[model samples]
Each structure stands twice: as structure tokens, then as C-alpha cells.
Target: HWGYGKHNGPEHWHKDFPIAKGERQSPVDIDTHTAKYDPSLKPLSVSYDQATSLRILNNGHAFNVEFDDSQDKAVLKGGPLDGTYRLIQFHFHWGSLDGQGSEHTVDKKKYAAELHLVHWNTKYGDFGKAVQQPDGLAVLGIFLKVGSAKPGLQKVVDVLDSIKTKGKSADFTNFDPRGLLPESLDYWTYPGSLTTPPLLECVTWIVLKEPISVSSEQVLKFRKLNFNGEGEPEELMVDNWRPAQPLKNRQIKASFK
Candidate 1:
């Protein structure tokens, strides 16, 4: 059972999920100095249909919001992607300690948490079939700075109490994913793999330079979520972020000057 535990977490993920040790693994500490600006990189376009937000569920791994991807109802285009990528599911990564949960960091700076907006290319047919190919997935990484309460983030938090237990799901509709973005759309792009297990080298990571604000209280709701799977310790969810992996033979591109 792969989980956020001392002996069976990120470090041990490589044992079963071989790509966990892959060369193009993700969550690299982005050094702005090395990330060159690319005028060729197009601005990211987020056209998420609020009604498509189906449900928010606690899979024991993390709290995720699943969207209806039927015929690309919700889509993310531009940026490092050629055509468009269909919105699949999005989730957050947080920790027990404040300022220590983000998966991707800039110049070794970690945020209070990180948000992952996962999308899959339509050419791949479906997310299941997309994972096997390179450039099949596109994930937008948004950092979370703990401060004032963000209503954009709160909509999800308000339902946290509903899905407190693992394998639980609650209705979360008419919620626009675009509402959580910061004012700036500046970002850094790179070819990398999924931060989670079965870390296939297919994801194209696009992390925003700007971060959204979230109250510390909002984060507490995330921690209350219990992990699934039986026979596990009676512990609350916290500090479940994966460590930064090596950035081997990869170049990072910036969308702004």
C-alpha cells in the first residue's frame, strides 16, 4: 500500500513505481537564473466550465476535484501545449508545518502548499491512454501562500468537512477552477513526469510564477482528511508532498520577460 508514511512514502515509491526514479521526474527546485525567458511560449488559456465540476473526493491519497471531460467540456490551451488539453482532476499538496508542502519550489523556496491542475491531451484519446506517451499530459502548478482567506480556495475547503473520511465524495458543482489563479499568469515550463506514483515521463509541467493566498485555517481543513486503506495508523493527513527530484537533461522555459 503506497501512502504518505515514514517508510512507505516518496522515498520508497521508486521500489514498485520504477519511473519514480526516472530521469525526467518532477518537482524540481526551479532556479529563475537558469530558467530562460521564451517569447515563443504562448500564454496559458484556462477555459473551465463551472458546471463541469462534478465532485470532490477523498481518495486517501489526496483531496481531488474531478471534472467532466466529455468531449473537452473544460479545456486548457496555449502555454507549452500545442493544441488543447482537457481538464481531468485537480488536487492540493500540503503539510503539517506551514511553508513546507509545495511540490515545486523556486530557488529553494517552498510555499505553504501547491495546487495541481491536471489535463490530458485529446489526441491521446483518454487520460488512461495518454499517460503512455510523452507530452500526453499538461499540469498547471500553482503555489499557495498562507495569509488571508481566498474565497476561490474556500469553496473547496467548505466541502472538506463533508469528505472528511477517505473514499468519500461530495457534490461540488458550478465551481470554476480559473477563480483560484493569481493576478499574474507568468509561468515556467519544463518537460517532466507526474509528481505522484507511476510517475510516467509524460507530463509537461507549467508552474505559475505568482501564487494564490490561502488562510492557515483553510489549510487545517485539509489536514483533517483521513487517509484510506485499512490497518493504517489513525493519523490525519499532513505533509504529504513529494520531495524535489533531480532535473536531469531538462530545460525550463519561461512565459514572461
Candidate 2:
């Protein structure tokens, strides 16, 4: 299957998933010099209920905390969106160390990690169907910097041991995901694709300008997991992030001046 090793990494995905070179691929470098200031963008409105968290799973690529999206209790609104978008799951992309790991960069500056809160538009029904349309998803990217420990992130990291191997999972609930966000809601909005395979051109990316902090020790917890399953080659779960795709002629609009 697909992986982030030298042989099966992002560079090779285009072989099987040709959309890798599509017009709207994601994880782009956000150069503010070329960015546009859009006053029309609304202030992002995020409301997530702690009771909606379901479980955490090591889905081979990354660990994501799944959420119960049966209702509108936990959904994202405004900020370059046309309708309600349900928060389905949230995952992270982190480096082996502190220097680099974020999928999208700002002016070539890298961060310790990045958190992606994946949401699907209710206008197209469920995530399965929404993912096929042009405006199917809205992903919030919050960069992670190495600093003092963040209790919100530590709560999730504490459960990583239970899912140390690929395909492994454990029940994880009652989490206030909004606690992981930085105070500033300012962001850069772009029309892009998923950084992973199938790489569909269906996401309206909302990458926050401000980043939250995570201690160096806490980041180490993520590295303790394995990319392979229990009895496999003892591969460490690291560098699963796809590199920054080229920024073509698309617009990168900023919510703040």
C-alpha cells in the first residue's frame, strides 16, 4: 500500500494517484508577499461539544480522534464557507524532532507540527458523498511549536500508547477540541486538495496564522508509535507528512490585514 518511506512516499504517489499534480493539490507554502487580504471573509465560528468524541485510531498514516457527527452540535461555520461543515475527525503531522513537520508552511518557515481538523460540508450529505464535490471539505490547520506542554494536547498524547501500532485503536471521548486552538482565529483560506491519496480537489483550507505550543517531550510521545503493525519490522511512526505542493495560480486570502 501507500507509505511515507523513500520508496512509497509522496513523490511516488503520483504513479498510482495521478491527481497528485492536479491544479488544487494541498499543503502549499503560504508566501504572504503574494497573498491577498480579503475583507469579505467572515470571522470563523467554531463550536464543538466535548461529548461528541468517539475514539482514537492509528490509521497507518497518522492517529486521528474520531468524532460523532450525527448532529450539528459540533460543526464549523463562516470563514470562507457557504454552509455548515461538520467536524468529523482531527489528526496531526509532526516531525521526528523539533525543526520541521507542518504540511503547509508560511514564507518557508516550518513548525514543530500541525493539527488538522477535518470537516465536511452538510450541503452534500455525508463525508463520503461530500468528498467528491468541489466544495466538500473544510480543514483547519493549526501549527504546533515546541514550548511548554499544552494540557489539551497532552490529554490526547496520553492515549497514544494504547494505539502504538498501525490499525490499533482505543475509546477516547469527552474532549474539548477547541481548547487546542490558539487565541487568534486569523487564517489563510485557499482552495486545495487532500495531502493524502485520492488527493481529491475538494477542500477549502483554513490554516490559522497563530500556532499553539507543545513541549518537546510531548512530541516524543507521538514518535513512540509504529508505522507498521504489532509484529512488523518495528518501523517508527514519523515523517508521514506530505511535502508542500507547488502553489499555482490559485489565490491565498488572509482574514486579517
Relative to the unseen true structure, what is the C-alpha lDDT of residue 193 in candidate 2, on a scale of 0 to 100? 95
RMSD in angstroms between candidate 1 and the native structure over all alpha carbons? 1.5
lDDT tens digits, residue span 1-257, model 1: 88879888999998999889788999899999999999988888988754289899988888899998877788889988988899989999998878699999899999989999999999989999999989899999999988998888888988988887688899998888878888998999999998888889999999999999989899888888888534566678888889899998988899987
Predicted structure with the largest lDDT when compared to the true one: 2
Q: Where's the lowest-lDDT run of ten residues in candidate 1? A: 226-235
Clashing pairs in 2: none
**What is the C-alpha lDDT profile of model 2 across 111-148, one tens digit per residue?**
98999999999988899999999999999999999998
Q: All candidates' lDDT scores?
A: 0.88, 0.92
Off by over 4 Å in 2: none
